């Protein structure tokens, strides 16, 4: 199945707009993903990683993005922070896998990269498996902002500052999470 392209995409979407792809009616050979020698983090909830290819599911979803290393720990169920609460929420009844590996070589330049953004202001925390991509001047206080920045009017998105000289805790990591679903429909993927 075309897991090769999802794991070899030249560019990855921003955290606040995680890139989602659907896979169904295929033949699953997950071992190929182990081609990448490095893996900073590799975990699975609900399924043993060694017996992934011996199961049958209705379909799967791959959600990929790029984050900072010290935030990679916020991609587990029942977590909290500035990522798990406003950019990507995992329901407790989670059955899937999460993979994260460093991307210092390809996603860092001396000048400084501002192509990756993450949300920083929001009124309420996101529901599990939900997305919100709507640029708008966040308003604080009773006064109306009228769509202009100022004392209590800010830009929700914040731009990561990437430089090759940053520490290990700031070099970007590519992250991909696979979610499996099985339902009344026939078990196609196997």
């Amino acid at each position, epitope marked *: 199945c075309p897991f090769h392209e999802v794991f070899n995409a030249t560019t990855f979407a921003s955290v606040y707009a995680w890139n989602r792809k659907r896979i169904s009616n295929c033949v699953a050979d997950y071992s190929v993903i182990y081609n990448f020698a490095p893996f900073f983090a590799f975990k699975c909830y609900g399924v043993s990683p060694t017996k992934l290819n011996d199961l049958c599911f209705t379909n799967v979803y791959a959600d990929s993005f790029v984050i900072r290393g010290n935030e990679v720990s916020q991609i587990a169920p029942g977590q909290t922070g*500035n990522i798990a*609460d*406003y950019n990507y929420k995992l329901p407790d009844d989670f059955t899937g896998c999460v993979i994260a590996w460093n991307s210092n070589k390809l996603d860092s330049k001396p000048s*400084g990269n501002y192509n990756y953004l993450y949300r*920083l*202001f*929001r*009124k309420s*925390k996101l529901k599990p498996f939900e997305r919100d991509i709507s640029t708008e001047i966040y308003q*604080a*206080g*009773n*006064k109306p902002c009228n769509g202009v*920045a*100022g*004392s*209590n009017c*800010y*830009s929700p998105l*914040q*731009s990561y*500052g990437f430089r090759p000289t*940053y*520490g290990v805790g*700031h070099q970007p990591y590519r992250v991909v999470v696979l979610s499996f679903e099985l339902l009344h429909a026939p078990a196609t993927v196997c």
Partner: antibody
Amino acid sequence: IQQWGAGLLKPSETLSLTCAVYDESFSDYFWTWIRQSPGMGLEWIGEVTHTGSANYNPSLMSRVTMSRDTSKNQISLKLTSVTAADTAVYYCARDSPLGSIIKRGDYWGQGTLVT
Amino acid sequence: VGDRVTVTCQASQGITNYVNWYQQKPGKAPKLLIYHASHLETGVPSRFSGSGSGTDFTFTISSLQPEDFATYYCQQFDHLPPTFG
């Protein structure tokens, strides 16, 4: 937090102060400058948000000028016209942005006095 | 002095829910004790607290420890510019 600048001045000139931090998360916090006249309350000068901007107090709008420096992680404050009515002590303050609320001024520098 | 003390802060024009309470000592930089009404900073042992909206904000202390001698200050967030007291 560290600070420095000009200590003794003469009326009708310009003042420049610099506030420097010693961490690496100097990209996601609001940074404000506080002025305190000798033994008389406090005053609010201006602030710089996360995305390299600035908001100035209306009374001192034109005179004041704030700026950042991400390469060395510093903040610069400039006053165009100094006099004998601006003698005070200046503090460098930080605000951490939370979700829908801002914990204004949760950390203050030692500051410095000017005449 | 000794057991209890209570202070009040008021606003003339406009109402708000945002206020802060700071502490000062002889020649040291001010510290923030309370932010956003009753919400407390994680540095407040001796029950420094105060809760109230509607232009009648209050600051209350349960007991006076040996290191409680300051010039506590109010503050505002909204209605730019912020003004102290």
